Design a protein around this ligand. Structure first.
Ligand SMILES: O=C1C[C@@H](c2ccc(O)cc2)Oc2cc(O)cc(O)c21
Ligand SMILES: O=C1C[C@@H](c2ccc(O)cc2)Oc2cc(O)cc(O)c21
Ligand SMILES: [Ca+2]
Ligand SMILES: [Ca+2]
Lengths: 117, 115, 117, 115
């Protein structure tokens, strides 16, 4: 019953991207981004436990993935500052969201898998 | 031009036409000051955003209005938009092409930077 | 200890791609593709149990994913006949391979995550 | 031309230059008969593979020699190559651009088909 999971993979090494910082924000009624949760990717490149079913109410959310630090630490100066995912959540009732990102120094892809528990 | 944006549609196998694109420059106060905008052409390209003089070093944001594009096609989208944030010109002036490949629940962006 | 897993996701629906046929082949000493394993993706879009550590000897392998049937069944005539992954395996000792594919009607991406148990 | 192939490098943020590409047509016996080939240009493009007359309906294979490209750059690659298999012209003649974005452990291909 974790309703939000983020998973990050490295397209160069063919590996999970470990220790990647992730910050999650929620758009406020006044229209600004309130901090909602944060964490770092595990060995498996996954970040669990960000939120709960109750807390994770309808809204617009932003997941910012600190790809730049991940590359810089490997000696690489990447193109992007970060990878950002912005989406409306739970608009038709609660769902479970997996936000997956695949990283290369000059490219990233992002895909959402959304399921109905 | 020093900056071009090009958008493709993975569902139809075509350029993504009439997609709104906004470009911003990060301000001293860490706000985004809007800088240039346009809509992609019938080839999915947006040219003429900026000039070599104007396009000085800094951190830039390209915001692509993916949601409106999908809505227009009658297809439900996941993302609000697709954003590309990058530092420009850090080693000199370059020509940047920002390319995006769009699916309703996924997108991929790549930069082709040539000097 | 499953050394080969294939995972397929649908970029249109934001879902696993279920019931996707997958065929695996191994290049023979005579240079032709011998059938090695086959299966279909589960509800979670994953296919496990293709092979074993002992069977999965060094070689060149091909994973063919029947994307066309997956789309056609949804009413869609897709661009690709299939998605094929060809790779050398276990060249430096045994590894565990996850072959992931993300599908759209006119595009697919494939990524390998390779780990050392 | 009715068929173009374009290859980009996600590691360097550049066109992938001097990449070998082979094109095949499926034969009656379900073998691949090699049809056209080339190497990508400094812009990552390969033009001139075929002509409208020659490019009749059928099933075609495009094989991109990704492995050699990475080897040349000194980077270890996962794939032997990247293949694109598709049926051409089923609704009429079209112009096909096959685009590939390459990373050492990943690739993505997309078709832009215009009539
Ligand atoms: O290995 C991958 C690659 C990743 C991915 C592919 C494409 C994309 O656009 C974004 C992420 O997809 C995945 C999604 C998963 O749930 C688990 C995975 O192991 C993987
Ligand atoms: O930079 C890119 C990436 C590429 C692409 C992205 C995703 C994918 O899955 C396959 C190809 O598309 C392009 C197509 C072009 O005409 C010019 C380009 O610069 C690009
Ligand atoms: Ca400059
Ligand atoms: Ca024809």
């Amino acid at each position: 019953a974790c309703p939000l999971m983020v998973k990050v993979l490295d397209a160069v090494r063919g590996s999970p991207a470990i220790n990647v910082a992730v910050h999650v924000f929620r758009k406020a009624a006044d229209d600004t981004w309130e901090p909602f949760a944060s964490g770092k990717t595990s060995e498996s490149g996954e970040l669990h436990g960000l939120t709960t079913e109750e807390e994770f109410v309808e809204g617009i959310y932003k997941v910012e993935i600190d790809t730049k630090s991940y590359w810089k630490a490997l000696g690489i100066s990447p193109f992007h500052e970060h990878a950002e995912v912005v989406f409306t959540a739970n608009d038709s009732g609660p769902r479970r969201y997996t936000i997956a990102a695949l990283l290369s120094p000059y490219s990233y892809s992002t895909t959402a898998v959304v399921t109905n528990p």
